[PDB]
Amino acid sequence: SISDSQIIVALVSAFITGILALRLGKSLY
Amino acid sequence: GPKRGSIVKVLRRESYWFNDTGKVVAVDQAPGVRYPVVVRFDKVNYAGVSTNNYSPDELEAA
Amino acid sequence: ASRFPKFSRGLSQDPTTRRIWFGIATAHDFESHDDMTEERLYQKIFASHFGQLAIIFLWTSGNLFHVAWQGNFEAWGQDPLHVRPIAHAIWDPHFGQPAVEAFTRGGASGPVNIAYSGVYQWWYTIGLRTNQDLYGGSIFLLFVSALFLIAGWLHLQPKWKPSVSWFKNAESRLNHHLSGLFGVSSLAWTGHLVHVAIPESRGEHVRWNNLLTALPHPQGLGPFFAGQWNVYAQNPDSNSHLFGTSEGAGTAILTFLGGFHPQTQSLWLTDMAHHHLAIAVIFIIAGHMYRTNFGIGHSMKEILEAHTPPGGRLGRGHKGLYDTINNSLHFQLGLALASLGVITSLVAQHMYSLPPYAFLAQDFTTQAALYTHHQYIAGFIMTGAFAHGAIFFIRDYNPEQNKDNVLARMLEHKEAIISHLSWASLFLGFHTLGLYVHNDVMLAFGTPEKQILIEPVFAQWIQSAHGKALYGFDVLLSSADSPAFNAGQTLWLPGWLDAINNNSNSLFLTIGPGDFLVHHAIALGLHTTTLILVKGALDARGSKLMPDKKEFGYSFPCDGPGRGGTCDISAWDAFYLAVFWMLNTIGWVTFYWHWKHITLWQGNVAQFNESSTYLMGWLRDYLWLNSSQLINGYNPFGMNSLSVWAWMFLFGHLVWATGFMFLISWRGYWQELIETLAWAHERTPLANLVRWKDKPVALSIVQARLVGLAHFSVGYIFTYAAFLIASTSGKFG
Amino acid sequence: AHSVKIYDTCIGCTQCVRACPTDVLEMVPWDGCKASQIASAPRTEDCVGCKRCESACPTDFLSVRVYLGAETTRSMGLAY
Amino acid sequence: EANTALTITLSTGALLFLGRFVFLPFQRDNVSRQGLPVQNGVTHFDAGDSRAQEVTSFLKTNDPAGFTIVDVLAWGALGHAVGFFILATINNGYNPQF
Amino acid sequence: DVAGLTPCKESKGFAKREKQEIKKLESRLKLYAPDSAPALALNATIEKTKRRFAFYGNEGLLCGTDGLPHLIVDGDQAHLGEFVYPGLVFLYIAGWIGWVGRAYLIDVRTSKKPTEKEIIIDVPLALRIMSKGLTWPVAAIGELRSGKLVEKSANITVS
Amino acid sequence: EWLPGNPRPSYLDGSAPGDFGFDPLGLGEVPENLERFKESELIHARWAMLAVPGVLIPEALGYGNWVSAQKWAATPGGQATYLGNPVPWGNLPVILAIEFLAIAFAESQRNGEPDPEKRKYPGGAFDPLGFSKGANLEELKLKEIKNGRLALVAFLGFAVQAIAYPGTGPLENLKTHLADPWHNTIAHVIIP
Amino acid sequence: MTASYLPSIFVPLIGLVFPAITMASLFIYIEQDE
Ligand SMILES: CCCCCCCCCCCCCCCCCC(=O)OC[C@H](CO[C@@H]1O[C@H](CO[C@H]2O[C@H](CO)[C@H](O)[C@H](O)[C@H]2O)[C@H](O)[C@H](O)[C@H]1O)OC(=O)CCCCCCCCCCCCCCCCC
Ligand code: CLA
Ligand code: CLA
Ligand SMILES: CC1=C(/C=C/C(C)=C/C=C/C(C)=C/C=C/C=C(C)/C=C/C=C(C)/C=C/C2=C(C)CCCC2(C)C)C(C)(C)CCC1
Ligand SMILES: CC1=C(/C=C/C(C)=C/C=C/C(C)=C/C=C/C=C(C)/C=C/C=C(C)/C=C/C2=C(C)CCCC2(C)C)C(C)(C)CCC1
Ligand SMILES: CC1=C(C/C=C(\C)CCC[C@H](C)CCC[C@H](C)CCCC(C)C)C(=O)c2ccccc2C1=O
Structure with a gap:
């Protein structure tokens, strides 16, 4: 990630994955 | 049940004296007793008692 | 179901503080919950497995991203003997100037940690040469973890839940695991080693943009389909080969050479490719053994039933050992844990004798960490296998079905x-x-x-x-x-x-x-x-x-x-x-x-x-x-790079000693102490406006044993990790 | 909330009820051993788990068994 | 030179002969002996599985001996395996004896 | 020879392990008069050291790369004096102890108060059994052959 | 009667041919196990009876060694024969192919028989001389068994001698015996 | 490090704020009778 936009891409992808994990946890409870 | 002073071997699966021998003391001959045979053993259990009562179908080896 | 633990009533009606504790403890024992059936349990296991895979892949992607962003992988690639691999950067607002000057070693511009996990040699062997490759791997792993979370949520929706009878299909599950998950995965790894790893070791760049252009053998796929298979073992690399360059490199993709590469002192890449091809073929062949729905194949129950030797030497043989292992999850968990804990010691015993990664066995502080890590993991796993065997014997064993088989004669x-x-x-x-x-x-x-x-x-x-x-x-x-x-x-x-x-x-x-x-x-x-x-x-x-x-x-x-x-x-x-x-x-x-x-x-x-x-x-x-050098990590004359370990070391001891506190003293003292502490809180002005909800009580008996063991284990692990890293890396052998 | 049980081997020693410091166990007419006595646990809602009952029955294994269950305020022995 | 088109066809033909002719009653009796995977006393399909159902539309055959397509697949796979195991060996030349 | 160890009477590292110790003892010795108890004790120690080092070389033990004996507990006929020869006499003594203890227990068990005869030993009977316990193998094998060694109605129970 | 006076077990009553009462390990205690064991013993005996001339003849006539007579592999060429003429169709793969196929067919044929009597004593096209029609038959079975066990022991001796004395056959060992019976004997490999 | 201003933004937002809010949320969820 020697570039600058790539960090933002990683951040937004981590956020999407977090929302997915949130939905899964809600379904598990 | 068995005779007095008879040496019988226990079969009660949850007994400290399982597969051990003991001499009967006095079997009560009442009509509705569920465990009339009284047998005393020569080795105490974890609690320290050596006498216990069983049903006639629960111990016999002679 | 109206309080914190909604899966149990006994803890809900608990007014004491214990309700909290035993809510976190019995949180994954899905069997002993309220209103549990054999079809909710299995689906919860499935979804938790999906979540676990997601977490694993997120961890791996994080490692990749942090080595790509803050590490010095590119520099390490061109001098893997006179540079230290950076794990990540540190930003501690409590640091002092000497600490910043001490931890700023390596090539970084600020203070950083040095990676003692060996990921640098691993990634460099399999053919990664630029931070761009690490970032691509990281985003791809984020993607696959998102996909696993998607599937985990999907298979809990009512339309797509699998039935309990689908899980118990042991024949097809074992068939598919053996064939696909092992053989096809090893075959794909062989393909990657042949296409990307071995050529990048020879020197030539090979990536996605030229996959279908550059072939891994001057006469690719001709000799293969004609049975002339030795052609792929014609000329390997010699003793003069420089790993990374083409100075004395051959063209064979598969061979059986044995020994170590004279420069890197590690196994030959072509040897790993050949081994993976062999075991892939073996696993694919071994897959087609059990009858799924195609007529041919075995019935894994009549195999078990057929093995009672005549002569009654061990009773009724293995008759009935299919239903016990199928219905009881703890039996399968124990078998899995034992078989996994044997091979996770095998890897430890092998990777140090035969180092499989380039320029390993020269990082004298990494091999020690790897061995210690894997051996402690193997110990914990071998203990868990017996724990779950005991749980099976307690709550899953039926003495009537298992009438006079081997499992009963073990208790006999x-x-x-x-x-x-x-x-x-x-x-x-x-x-x-x-x-x-x-x-x-x-x-x-x-x-x-x-x-x-x-x-x-x-x-x-x-x-x-x-x-x-x-x-x-x-x-x-x-x-x-x-x-x-x-x-x-x-x-x-x-x-x-x-x-x-x-x-x-x-x-x-x-x-x-x-x-x-x-x-x-x-x-x-x-x-x-x-x-x-x-x-x-x-x-x-x-x-x-x-x-x-x-x-x-x-x-x-x-x-x-x-x-x-x-x-x-x-x-x-x-x-x-x-x-x-x-x-x-x-x-x-x-x-x-x-x-x-x-x-x-x-x-x-x-x-x-x-x-x-x-x-x-x-x-x-x-x-x-x-x-x-460990205890001298800091002194009245200054401090140096080992200072952190000199802290952690001592830290370990403390935690370890604290474990004794929970193992020597028992509850009846602490409860009689809390009973007067509560009095003192109630009978003071200006502090009885506040009030506790959960009645304060002393920790339970098994809870005290658990906390004591946890402290003992954390201290035992930490004060030895610190020592093994400081005493070695402070000298590097 | 603990679960007390009295199996049909009590010889009517009356020691279980003498030992229990909560007035949980009581004697009951039940013909069959020697004296038509047996133990009975009607007030299990007050047992703390003292297990003084089990430490008194001089039977082969035991005739009165306490099983620790859901915890409450009475069973925890709290006074605050 | 090790010619292929004849050696692997000879291997496949030999193992197809073995399957169709000499081992077919043995194979049939051993399959019928241990018929269907069974859980708790009843097969997977009857225990409930839309995916544990045999495919008779794939098994309906006409060979007088009942040589379905999966038997041909299996015996030909073994034939190709032995054929390539023979092919790969006779190309090197060695001396691994006593 | 075996295991890459040289015999001790040719080991050039045993000579040092001897002469260094000797010289240390002599350095200790030179702090007294040759007619005083410390000097006599030290000379006795030196003579004992020489007698010890002049026995290992003659026995046939194999020394190491550091000048220290190494025991080949293998079964090698040229080295039976290291494990199997003392092991046999130890097994004899231990079987003796076990057999006489077992026989004492067996005899005491058939008495009036067998528990009394275990905190208060009866020396005549114990001595008799200790004496008779010399030929214990010829008795243990005889009790095995005659089916008198083991019981069958053991009192283990598990519900 | 392998031990004059000793009794017999409850299953070794001597009815079977070649039965003497030898079972110290107690293997034939189970009936079906004994029924399989008898047929297995007969098969081993017949194979060893076939093998013994097959090793004794070609060493003195075709000049082989029965362990170098199989050495011609791992080296292209060999395939000697009776007069020594090379068999042109004796290439190892194409010879192992038929060696497998023919024996597989024969065994898969023999395996299909319910009758144990016809299992270990087929007859028919296997007795094409009327040797077992109605004449002395139990005596013939006894002769067959007594020769088969001797052949088994002889072949075991073959296989142990060829290992104790490598690179030689069990016929030069007879000449070694008769060169010095009192120095050349088993007491060399047993007591080195 | 490209950004080099993110470690000054995140560890204060992950070692101080994140526990501060999740402990409060979990304490509200624990100490409630529904
Ligand atoms: C990886 C960690 C990730 C980070 C984690 C950090 C989070 C902080 C940890 C929180 C720990 C909370 C305090 C400890 C747990 C409480 C102890 C306790 O209540 O303990 C008792 C628990 C709960 O007991 C249960 O108690 C139950 C009580 O029943 C209750 O529940 C029943 C239904 O559940 C009914 O409702 C019943 O009415 C009701 O009373 C029954 O007795 C069950 O049989 C019994 O299991 O017992 C159990 O089985 C124990 C369950 C845990 C077993 C795991 C032990 C493994 C220890 C390995 C050693 C650790 C080493 C660390 C190495 C690290 C190296 C660096
Ligand atoms: C599990 C993987 C993992 C771990 C342990 C770490 C650890 C760390 N990261 Mg990090 N990171 C990761 C993945 C990971 N990272 C990924 C995938 C990305 C790309 C989005 C980043 C992007 C990132 C940045 C930009 C920064 C850090 C920083 C840091 C450090 C300070 C903590 C912090 O601010 O985190 C903040 C974390 C995030 C902003 C994103 C979290 C990433 C994933 C989604 C979390 C994984 C969830 C996890 C598996 C569940 C834990 C469960 C557990 C509680 C039981 C710390 C060493 C800081 C640093 O370098 O300080 C020196 C910093 O500035 N990280
Ligand atoms: C080809 C078909 C196929 C494939 C690929 C899989 C694959 C998988 N199934 Mg699966 N399954 C299948 C068919 C298949 N299944 C069928 C037909 C059924 C119907 C019965 C099921 C029913 C089923 C259930 C019920 C469950 C799974 C689960 C799983 C997962 C196991 C966990 C895991 O990832 O371990 C990965 C393991 C390996 C990659 C094997 C590695 C070999 C050893 C162990 C390690 C060696 C590593 C090597 C030496 C070094 C590498 C390390 C490197 C860093 C150097 C895995 C993804 C489980 C799961 O995850 O749930 C979601 C689960 O609970 N399956
Ligand atoms: C030498 C050698 C070899 C061999 C090897 C082998 C053969 C090995 C083996 C190994 C082994 C042999 C191992 C084992 C292991 C074991 C274990 C590890 C166990 C465990 C167990 C457990 C854990 C249990 C549990 C349980 C219970 C308790 C109850 C219930 C059930 C269960 C099962 C769960 C070879 C040839 C190859 C090569 C060369 C050399
Ligand atoms: C109709 C008819 C007929 C005909 C038939 C035919 C013509 C047949 C053929 C058949 C065939 C022609 C078959 C084939 C098959 C094949 C197969 C089945 C294959 C498989 C393969 C495999 C599986 C392979 C694998 C592998 C790989 C891929 C790689 C490498 C390794 C191996 C080799 C392993 C007749 C005349 C008789 C009669 C009348 C009727
Ligand atoms: C100290 C002690 C106590 C009393 C200790 C108490 C009440 C524990 C409470 C300590 C504080 C209040 C919590 C500490 C916080 C931890 C750092 C982490 C908490 C758990 C995480 C999940 C947050 C016992 O009750 C006891 C019982 C039986 C044997 C030994 C002992 C024992 O040694």
Whole structure:
């Protein structure tokens, strides 16, 4: 990630994955 | 049940004296007793008692 | 279901603070919940598995991203001997200027940590040469973790839930696992090694943009489909090959060379490709064995039923052993954990002798960390296997279905097994301690020539049978006339005999009287640990002291003071006692390994070879001597890079000691203390406006044992990780 | 909330009820051993788990068995 | 030179002969002996599985001996395996004896 | 020879392990008069050291690369004096102890108060059994052959 | 009667041919196990009876060694025969192919028989001389068994001698015996 | 490090704020009778 936009891409992808994990946890409870 | 002073071997699966021998003391001959045979053993259990009562179908080896 | 634990009523109606604790403890025991059926349980297992995979892949992607963003991978690639791999950067607002100047080593612009996990050599071997590749891997792993989370949520929706009868389809599941998950995965790895790893090792760049252009062999796929398979083993790399460049590199993709690459001192890439191809074919062939729905294939129940030998030597054989393993999840969990814990020790024992990554065995501080890590993991796993075997015996075993099979006859004669394990452990301990103390006294009285030094003739004979030529045994692989020698003379022995007869690597290090005693101490540790665990698992259903233990469950504190005293009687307590012995055995093994390799790397093997036969030598030449830079990590004269470890080390001790607090003192004191603390809080002004909701109570009995064991284990792990990293990396062998 | 049980082997020693410091166990007419006595646990809602009952029955294994269950304020022995 | 088109066809033909002719009653009796995977006393399909159903639309055959397509697949796979195991060996030349 | 160890009477590292110790003892000795108890004790120690080092070389033990004996517990006929020869006499003594203890227990068990005869030994009977316990193998094997060694109605129970 | 006077087990009553009462390990205690064991013994005996001339003849006539007579592999060429003429169709793969196929067919044929009597004593096209029609038959079975066990022992001796004395056959060992019976004997490999 | 201003933004937002809010949320969820 020697570039600058790539960090933002990683951040937004981590956020999407977090929302997915949130939905899964809600379904598990 | 068995005779007095008879040496019988226990079969009660949850007994400290399982597969051990003991001499009967006095079997009560009442009509509705569920465990009339009284047998005393020569080795105490974890609690320290050596006498216990069983049903006639629960111990016999002679 | 109206309070914190909604899966249990007993904890909901608990007014005390214990409701909190036992809510976090019994949070994953889906079996002992409220209103549980065999179809909700399995689907919860499925979804939790998906979540676990997601977490694993997120962790791996994080490692990739943090090595790509803050690491110095590119610099390390062009000088993997005079640079230190950076794990990540640190930003601690409590730091002082000397700490910033101390931790700013390497090539970084600020303070950073040094990666002792060996990921640099791994990633460099498989063909990663730029931070761009690491970032691509990281985003791809984020993607696959998102996909796993998607599937985990999907398979909980009512339309797509699998049935309980689908899970119990053992035949098709084993078939598909064996074929796909093993063979096809190994085949794909072979493809990657052939296409991307081996050419990048030869020197030429190969990526997605030119996959279909650059072929991995000058005559690709012709000889393969014509059966002329030796063409792919024509000319390998020579002793002059520089890993990374094309200075003396061949063109063969598959071969069987044996030994280590003379530069990197690691196995040949083509050898790994060939091995993966072979095991892929083996697994794919072994897949098609059980009948799924195509007519052919076995019935894994009639196989079990058919193996009762005639003569009644072991009763009714394996009749009924299918339903027990199918219906009971703890049986499968125990089998899985045991089989996994054997191979996660196999990897530890192998990766150090035969380093599989480029420029490993030169990071003297990484191999130690890897070995210690994997051995402690293996110890914990081997303990968990027996724990779950005991749980199965308690709550899943049916004595009527398992009528007179082998599993019942194991309970039928358990007294003999426990007696003989007792005898073996007693014998080993008596004699090992006796010899060690005798040598200690002999060295103490100034007469070192009167100690019982025993040469390990059996292991030395085995090493000689593997090709070592130090003990002159000349048996079966040192003999030049043995057919075993002539058979492999053309294929791999030129490299194997070369590597094993070089006394500078970890391939079958020489052994003397000092190794004998440590191997016997290891045997004693293993024996005592299995004794505790087997005694627990067997007398988990009931003993003469308490012949109804199955009705009380796995973990219960005791059965009162009566009947002489029945404290610490459950099977969970057997496991809790065995954890200590597991930690002790693994500590012995790691001490042995670390001292042997420290003395090998320094240059004086004759210090271990001579100062280990007694016991003060271990305390003075290993523990006390190798702690000189650790504790000096900071002093009234300054501080240096090891300071953090010098902290962590001490930290460990503290935690370790705190464990004793929960294991020596018991509840009845702390409850009688809390009962007056509550009084003091209630009878004070200005502080009785506040008020607790959960009544404060002392920790429970099994809870106290658990917290004590957790503290003991965390301290034990930390104060040794710190020491093994500081004493090695502070000297680098 | 603990679960007390009295199996049909009590010889009517009356020691279980004498030992229990909560007035939980009581005697009951039940013909069959010697004296038509047996134990009975009607007030299990007050047992703390003292296990003084089990430490008194001089039977082979036992005739009165306490099983520790859901915890409450009475069973925890709290006074605050 | 090790010619292929004849050696692997000879291997496949030999193992197809073995399957169709000499081992077919043995194979049939051993399959019928241990018929269907069974859980708790009843097969997977009847225990409930839309995916544990045999495919008779794939098994309906006409060979007088009942040589379905999966038997041909299996015996030909073994034939190709032995054929390539023979092919790969006779191309090197060695001397691994006593 | 075996295991790459040289015999001890040719080991050039045993000579040092001897002469260094000797010289240390002499350095200790030179702090007294040759007619005083410390000097006599030290000379006795030196003579004992010489007698010890002039026995290992003659026995046939193999020394190491550091000048220290190493025991070949293998079964090698040229080295039976290290493990199997003392092991046999130890096994004899231990079987003796175990057999006489077992026989004492067996005899005491058939008495009036067998528990009393275990905190208060009866020396005549114990001595008789200790005496008769010389030929224990010929008795243990005889009890095994005659089916008198083991029981069958053991009192283990597990519900 | 392998031990004059000793009794017999409850299953070794001597009815079977070649039965003497030898079972110290107690293997034939189970009936079906004994029924399989008898047929297995007969098969081993017949194979060893076939093998013994097959090793004794070609060493004196075709000049082989029965362990070098199989050495011609791993080296292209060999395939000697009776007069020594090379068999042109004796290439190892294409010879192992038929060696497998023919024996597989023969065994898969023999395996299909329910009758144990016809199992170990087929007859028919295997007795094409009327040797077992109605004449002395139990005596013929006894002769067959007594020769088969001797052949088994002889072949075991073959295989142990060829290992103790490598690179030689069991016929030069007879000449070694009769060169010095009192120095050349088993007391060399047993007591080195 | 490209950004080099993110470690000053995140560890204060992950070692101080994240526990501060999740402990409060979990304490509200624990100490409630529904
Ligand atoms: C990886 C960690 C990730 C980070 C985690 C950090 C989070 C902080 C940890 C929180 C720990 C909370 C305090 C400890 C747990 C409380 C102890 C306790 O209540 O303990 C008791 C628990 C709960 O007991 C249960 O108690 C039950 C009580 O029943 C209750 O529940 C029943 C239904 O559940 C009914 O409702 C019933 O009415 C009701 O009373 C029954 O007795 C069950 O049989 C019994 O299991 O017991 C059990 O089985 C124990 C369950 C845990 C077993 C795991 C032990 C493993 C220990 C390995 C050693 C650790 C080493 C660390 C190494 C690290 C190296 C660096
Ligand atoms: C599990 C993987 C993992 C771990 C342990 C770490 C650890 C760390 N990261 Mg990090 N990171 C990761 C993945 C990971 N990272 C990924 C995938 C990305 C790309 C989005 C980043 C992007 C990132 C940045 C930009 C920064 C860090 C920083 C840091 C450090 C300070 C903590 C912090 O601010 O985190 C903040 C974390 C995030 C902003 C994103 C979290 C990433 C994933 C989604 C979390 C994984 C969830 C996890 C598996 C569940 C844990 C469960 C557990 C509680 C039981 C710390 C060493 C800081 C640093 O370098 O300080 C020196 C910093 O500035 N990280
Ligand atoms: C080809 C078909 C196929 C494939 C690929 C899989 C694959 C998988 N199934 Mg699956 N399944 C299938 C068919 C298949 N299934 C069928 C037909 C059924 C119907 C019965 C099921 C029913 C089923 C259930 C019920 C469950 C799974 C689960 C799983 C997962 C196991 C966990 C895991 O990833 O371990 C990965 C393991 C490996 C990659 C094997 C590695 C080999 C050893 C162990 C390690 C060696 C590593 C090597 C030496 C070094 C590499 C390390 C490197 C860093 C150097 C895995 C993804 C489980 C799961 O995850 O749930 C979601 C689960 O609970 N399956
Ligand atoms: C309690 C219980 C349980 C558990 C158990 C366990 C946990 C176990 C473990 C165990 C173990 C963990 C074991 C292991 C084993 C191992 C082995 C057995 C090995 C072997 C090896 C081998 C065989 C080798 C060989 C060889 C050699 C030596 C050399 C060369 C090569 C070869 C390979 C040949 C269960 C759940 C089941 C059930 C219930 C109960
Ligand atoms: C109709 C008819 C007929 C005909 C038939 C035919 C013509 C047949 C053919 C058949 C065939 C023609 C078959 C084939 C098959 C094949 C197969 C089935 C294949 C498989 C393969 C495999 C599986 C392979 C694998 C592999 C790979 C891929 C790689 C490498 C390794 C291996 C080799 C393993 C007749 C005349 C008789 C009669 C009348 C009717
Ligand atoms: C100290 C002590 C107590 C009393 C200790 C108490 C009440 C524990 C509470 C300590 C504080 C309040 C919590 C500490 C916080 C931790 C750092 C982490 C908490 C758990 C995480 C999940 C947050 C016992 O009750 C006890 C019982 C039986 C044997 C030994 C002992 C024992 O040693």
